[PDB]
From Swiss-Prot, chain A:
Domain Glutamine amidotransferase type-1: 2-200
The gene coding this protein: hisH
InterPro entries to which the protein is assigned, alphabetical: Class_I_gatase-like, GATASE, Imidazole-glycPsynth_HisH
GO molecular function: glutaminase activity; imidazoleglycerol-phosphate synthase activity; lyase activity
Protein name: Imidazole glycerol phosphate synthase subunit HisH
Keywords associated with the record: Amino-acid biosynthesis, Cytoplasm, Glutamine amidotransferase, Histidine biosynthesis, Hydrolase, Lyase
Domain of life from the UniProt record: Bacteria
UniProtKB/Swiss-Prot annotation, chain B:
NCBIfam families, A to Z: hisF (TIGR00735)
Taxon lineage: Bacteria, Thermotogati, Thermotogota, Thermotogae, Thermotogales
Xref: InterPro entries: Aldolase_TIM, His_biosynth, HisF, IGPS_HisA/HisF, RibuloseP-bd_barrel
Gene from which this protein is expressed: hisF
GO cellular component: cytoplasm
Protein's recorded name: Imidazole glycerol phosphate synthase subunit HisF
Pathway(s) served: Amino-acid biosynthesis; L-histidine biosynthesis; L-histidine from 5-phospho-alpha-D-ribose 1-diphosphate: step 5/9
SUPFAM superfamilies per UniProt: Ribulose-phoshate binding barrel
Family statement drawn from the similarity comment of this UniProt entry: Belongs to the HisA/HisF family.
Amino acid sequence: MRIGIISVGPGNIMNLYRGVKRASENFEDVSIELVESPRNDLYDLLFIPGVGHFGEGMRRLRENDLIDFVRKHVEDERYVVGVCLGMQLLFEESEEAPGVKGLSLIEGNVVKLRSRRLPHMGWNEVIFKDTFPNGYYYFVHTYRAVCEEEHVLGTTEYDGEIFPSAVRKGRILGFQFHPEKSSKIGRKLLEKVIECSLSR
Amino acid sequence: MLAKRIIACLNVKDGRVVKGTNFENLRDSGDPVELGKFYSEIGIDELVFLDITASVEKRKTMLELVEKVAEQIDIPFTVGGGIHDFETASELILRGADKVSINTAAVENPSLITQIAQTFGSQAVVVAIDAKRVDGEFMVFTYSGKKNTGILLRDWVVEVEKRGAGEILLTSIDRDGTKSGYDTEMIRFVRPLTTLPIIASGGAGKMEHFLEAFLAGADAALAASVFHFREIDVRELKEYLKKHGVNVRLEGL
């Protein structure tokens, strides 16, 4: 098992890395590398974290030529897991950066939650269609995902508004919350991910 | 639904946990990191680290603290106490802190609140407001409650939100460390003046006090004594709050 973590996009990503190393603990031959640029080999599981403006992250994936690299992962049927800003980068565009296109690996766009308490920050419940454990995780975002029902994997409601907190398109996975900051429940979510990549 | 939060405060000095009644016989109560991991195991939703380290050493001891915590903790944490400028804040956040807390340096320079928000986002700014009743009005106090700024609490929470703060840590100097109960009157006073999240701090003594703070409008209840001493089991508390209509983060088996 080879796990890689893009570490260029804005925001803290070391937490994700740590949460993941702590998770990949109880597993055989499972390593972790901070993917800071295009490697020669492809990972079995890749993470696209980050926290910040949609423009940036996109402009950081381009700049350090990771776009083409990420794209090759999906094709070889390599898990590609976005987390927070990185789950939104799986889509086409955002009201955050109107012009700016994103990776576009998943059909949809990113819209600003329609709440007056703009920053959705705190522990909220996530209801999964399957696989992962239902419960409360920690959230810190302003924008959300707008995608067909087909890809919705996890749901959460905030201020009456129901939105996809999780996303999925085969081996590509997205999570809007910070599993690294979600206590015990976060580690099982992180582990379940690694356990899903032990197959392909 | 977004959950009402239970927050644990850890007053720390020169890298260790301290607990007393004042500088008086300020005593040593353990390792900050290991205590945080314990708080995260029982159900605490967030951590607030309040440092009072010497001074010349304040800036380097806090960075060491953040880093030590960031490599082992799995829940969000705020750091504060003596953060007087953008530099100090940015290093703590870049270092691993989720949010910083500023009080005295915020009142003297409201633009600071804004400077941090503009770079890291409101989500990273907690403004701690220490208030007390004085001649019938709610007054703001700085320098650990030793100076009456003359600014009213009503104008200040409004100013604070306007500048960009993302959360308020409201402490009642009157009830702080007394185990009598939270100052629910002060909480209700502030609730209508702002839409920002309110962390109730000061006076926590038993489970019902938490129910009282939340009925007053608090978004989160902070305490240090009670959880440490084990006087309150967080699991019991969350089940008690849920039983009576409060939406809390209930883990499960």
